[PDB]
Amino acid sequence: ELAHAENDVQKAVFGTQLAFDSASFVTGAAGIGAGLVGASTAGAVLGGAGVILGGLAVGFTALAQAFGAVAEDAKAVGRYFDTVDKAYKGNGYRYDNEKQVLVPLAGAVIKTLDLSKNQIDFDSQYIYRTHSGSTGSGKINYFFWVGDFPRMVHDRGQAIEVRSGIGYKDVSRPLEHGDSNVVILPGTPKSYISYEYMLLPGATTRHDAGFDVIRRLEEDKRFDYDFYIFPGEETIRRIHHEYVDTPIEVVLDQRNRQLVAPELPKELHGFLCYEIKGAGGEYLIGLNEGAKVNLTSDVASTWIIDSSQLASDSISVSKDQLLVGEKGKEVVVKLYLAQNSQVLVVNGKGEVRKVDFTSLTAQVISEDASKWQVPGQQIEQHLSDLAKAHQLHGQYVVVENYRHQGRDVGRAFYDVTKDRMLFTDTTNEQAKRAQLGAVMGDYAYFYDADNAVAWRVDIATGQVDAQFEPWFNQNAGHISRFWQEGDVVYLARRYRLKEREAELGYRIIGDRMELVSAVGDDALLQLSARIGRHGDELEAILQGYRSNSTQRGTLMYTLGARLIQPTSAALVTVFGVDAAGVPHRYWIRTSDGTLIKPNLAPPADQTLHFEAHEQTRSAWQIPADLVLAGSMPLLGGKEVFFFYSKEQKTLFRQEGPGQEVLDANQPSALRVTTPALTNVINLNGHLVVVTEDGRVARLDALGQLSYAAVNEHWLKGRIHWWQDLTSVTDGRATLAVFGVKDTDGKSLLPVWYHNGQVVVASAALQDKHPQFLGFEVDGSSARLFEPASGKLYRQPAMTADALAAAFGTDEVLEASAQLPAANELEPELHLKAAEQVDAGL
Numbered sequence: 001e002l003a004h005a006e007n008d009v010q011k012a013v014f015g016t017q018l019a020f021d022s023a024s025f026v027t028g029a030a031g032i033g034a035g036l037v038g039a040s041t042a043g044a045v046l047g048g049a050g051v052i053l054g055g056l057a058v059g060f061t062a063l064a065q066a067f068g069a070v071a072e073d074a075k076a077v078g079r080y081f082d083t084v085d086k087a088y089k090g091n092g093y094r095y096d097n098e099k100q101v102l103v104p105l106a107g108a109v110i111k112t113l114d115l116s117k118n119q120i121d122f123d124s125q126y127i128y129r130t131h132s133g134s135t136g137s138g139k140i141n142y143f144f145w146v147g148d149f150p151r152m153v154h155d156r157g158q159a160i161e162v163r164s165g166i167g168y169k170d171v172s173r174p175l176e177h178g179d180s181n182v183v184i185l186p187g188t189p190k191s192y193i194s195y196e197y198m199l200l201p202g203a204t205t206r207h208d209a210g211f212d213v214i215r216r217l218e219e220d221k222r223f224d225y226d227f228y229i230f231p232g233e234e235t236i237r238r239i240h241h242e243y244v245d246t247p248i249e250v251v252l253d254q255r256n257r258q259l260v261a262p263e264l265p266k267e268l269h270g271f272l273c274y275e276i277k278g279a280g281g282e283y284l285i286g287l288n289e290g291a292k293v294n295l296t297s298d299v300a301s302t303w304i305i306d307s308s309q310l311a312s313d314s315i316s317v318s319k320d321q322l323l324v325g326e327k328g329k330e331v332v333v334k335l336y337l338a339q340n341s342q343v344l345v346v347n348g349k350g351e352v353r354k355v356d357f358t359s360l361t362a363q364v365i366s367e368d369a370s371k372w373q374v375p376g377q378q379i380e381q382h383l384s385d386l387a388k389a390h391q392l393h394g395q396y397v398v399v400e401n402y403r404h405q406g407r408d409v410g411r412a413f414y415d416v417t418k419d420r421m422l423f424t425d426t427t428n429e430q431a432k433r434a435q436l437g438a439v440m441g442d443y444a445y446f447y448d449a450d451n452a453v454a455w456r457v458d459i460a461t462g463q464v465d466a467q468f469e470p471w472f473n474q475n476a477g478h479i480s481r482f483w484q485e486g487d488v489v490y491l492a493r494r495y496r497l498k499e500r501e502a503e504l505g506y507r508i509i510g511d512r513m514e515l516v517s518a519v520g521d522d523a524l525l526q527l528s529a530r531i532g533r534h535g536d537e538l539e540a541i542l543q544g545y546r547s548n549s550t551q552r553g554t555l556m557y558t559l560g561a562r563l564i565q566p567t568s569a570a571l572v573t574v575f576g577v578d579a580a581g582v583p584h585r586y587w588i589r590t591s592d593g594t595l596i597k598p599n600l601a602p603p604a605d606q607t608l609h610f611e612a613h614e615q616t617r618s619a620w621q622i623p624a625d626l627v628l629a630g631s632m633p634l635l636g637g638k639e640v641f642f643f644y645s646k647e648q649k650t651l652f653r654q655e656g657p658g659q660e661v662l663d664a665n666q667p668s669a670l671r672v673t674t675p676a677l678t679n680v681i682n683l684n685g686h687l688v689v690v691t692e693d694g695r696v697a698r699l700d701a702l703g704q705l706s707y708a709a710v711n712e713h714w715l716k717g718r719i720h721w722w723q724d725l726t727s728v729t730d731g732r733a734t735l736a737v738f739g740v741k742d743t744d745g746k747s748l749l750p751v752w753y754h755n756g757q758v759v760v761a762s763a764a765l766q767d768k769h770p771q772f773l774g775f776e777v778d779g780s781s782a783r784l785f786e787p788a789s790g791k792l793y794r795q796p797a798m799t800a801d802a803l804a805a806a807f808g809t810d811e812v813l814e815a816s817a818q819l820p821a822a823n824e825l826e827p828e829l830h831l832k833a834a835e836q837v838d839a840g841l
Helices: 020-029 058-088 211-217 376-392 522-528 541-548 721-728 800-806
Strands: 093-096 101-104 110-114 119-122 126-128 172-174 182-184 190-199 227-229 232-244 246-251 258-260 272-277 284-286 292-296 302-306 314-317 321-326 329-335 342-346 352-355 362-365 396-399 403-405 412-415 435-440 443-447 454-457 477-485 488-496 501-509 512-518 567-579 582-589 594-596 627-633 639-645 650-655 670-672 677-683 686-691 695-699 705-710 734-737 751-754 757-760 781-786 791-796
Touching: 020 058, 058 190, 058 211, 058 232, 058 677, 101 376, 182 376, 314 352, 321 342, 435 477, 443 477, 477 501, 522 541, 522 567, 522 582, 627 677, 627 686, 650 677, 705 721, 721 734, 721 800, 757 781
Parallel strands: 101 182, 110 246, 126 190, 182 258, 232 396, 246 272, 258 284, 272 292, 284 302, 292 329, 302 342, 512 567, 705 734
Antiparallel strands: 093 101, 110 119, 119 172, 190 232, 227 232, 314 321, 321 329, 342 352, 352 362, 396 412, 435 443, 443 454, 477 488, 488 501, 501 512, 567 582, 582 594, 627 639, 639 650, 650 670, 677 686, 686 695, 695 705, 734 751, 751 757, 781 791
8 A cells, every 4th residue: 555665675775876987986086085075164064964865876976977077177277287288398389391381389488489590489377376374284273274275376476487397497499390481470478377276086196188297386385286185185176367468579580481470369369469570581471360560670671461361451551550450450560660671561362562651552563463472271271270279278368457338347257168258247446356256157256355245246247236244344354265166155254353363164055145164262162062052143153253343344345235144054063172182063953053062982992081170071082074974863762973083084973962061971972883984975864984995885873884885996906806795795785886897998887796696787788877676586587677768677697607708807898798688577668667675576
């Protein structure tokens, strides 16, 4: 009757939606590099413990998708610095030996071509300096402050000023081949590079295209990459370029070579000026849009300009300069000719004009038709190639004094990939300098690094919408970090008080701003160590802070804001050093006001007792890295709470929130026995543990664990892992095997183990996300279900000899995939869902 809910069935732990790509990624990244997975930084909690039920294997998807999105940006940044190295490698230029053109490489920057000497003179791009607080090395040294994270020095005066950290230094080098030739002129300006950081598992340990170039640069403390902080490995998510006016110069020689200026993306126009200097001869300057050029023939010449690469062939002449193009967007040519050096203006066909400095006229002559200059196709091809690279770059560019609609909107950020998206949408002399923090799907978050304000921006590029107001606006300190994770965004405002510096951490979702952390104060922290239920106010934080006003509200330029004000969240953490040697930390369950109150038990080979005066303490002193893992119903009259500590690699279970008063003499959170615990994961409210030998087991309210898979780090190096897989559990084990690779060495082969039988999904199954189902009473026909097809299948078990054929000595399938093929089981049915049950399916 109704739904089944049957006991003994021995259904597999991971259940329905399991995909080996997502879980094998998440459990691999959790198995290395000393980071947590899926952790929150502002509040110290795993997995969003406010979510208490959901699909176990959906969490592996939600994690893998986010870390793939971070990995692709990280790789793009790598491929950029790879391209920069490949540009400075071989000194900025190549010669096309098949068609006799000198072509600039994509990414280098240059001061001048001493082309007579065939000698090239380089330039650096500058990257802003890394800076940070000092609570890590000293000061309030214990806990990991939120805002004390590496940040960027905004000021051009102190940037790491040199390319040479890529591995080599020079002023000049010889170019190998090019002379008596044609030359394309360099086409990228100098840049100031901004950067932005994001959490990425394995970032310290991956080796990908060009990452080594960045690893070479962070060897100087002025800049850091390949580094670790408490929540996990952090990496540069993306780049922003600020371009600076770049005078390249050219010094020609007594050979009638031809020059052409290269065509650049819409944003690069006007950042380049070319000094074309030389003597004698008849040299052609191929003009192009969005550049300035100067002619310095001061010995003698007659220099040619080609209009045909511009969209239009209209010209005007002036005693000092001439202009070519149309609609005012005409290339400015400044005409420092001497000794009756004169310019000839060539069109696409038939005509050249003599330009008259006295008449200001473009007198016709038919001296074109004269084979004076190279056919277009080769140059046009090279320019088509070069124009691609500058588009492909992606990333962002920063625009200063963006006049949107005549009105000057200040700084703007050109999204190279999309519709010019982000600018502040309002005219204010502070917001003119405002800093971009985070961007969403048609939302942008800006902030001021020095004043407590932040905006919602770019609602359909309309008006500015709302501004966020922290709980206090009247005292010194600043928003020390603005950063996002998982489409939520976190504010770490540092406050100054005449006692101490303090910090508050807010989380913003949608229209809500929420508080999730408070540093509080000793007089709060000791009155939190005891009885506590506070309701409408968090521990009288308001009466703990606002009494220390310093008129910082003089800087609250309220700018017509629709003010949004903080509201308090479930599981507000409170923490701080109460006194020397006594850390405290509590979680207020704001829904009910109770305190989660960790009473930690000394190591099993110790016990301590403490005097009655200090007795209001946890027995073991709370580690610096301690995080609430989510809490489960016990079915035994309480709720059970778990605490994790990555440095200690121990799990503490606690029944109920804790005592009404801390007793240091009988602890309450008990050090759970687990083998070599490497990490803990919370998935929609379900806990998962990863052992150091590479087994995975779910966990349940009595502290028991049931093994549920092995991992890549278990399969690696075993020559006959199907033998050793009997060792993972005492018996009646049903395991996925997340480590098995398809023959390409990239895809993952779905494998299970069940009562000694190994099931592998055959080539038709593999891409379909095969689910496992338990065996026919004949004990060889393993059932399977494939939810996308809706269809139910049957699949032979594979013998150890057949495994010895299908696999050599390795986790990767042989190309001789002599693999037992499936067949459908109940072809007449299309199934919404299939599950095991005691009576059957």
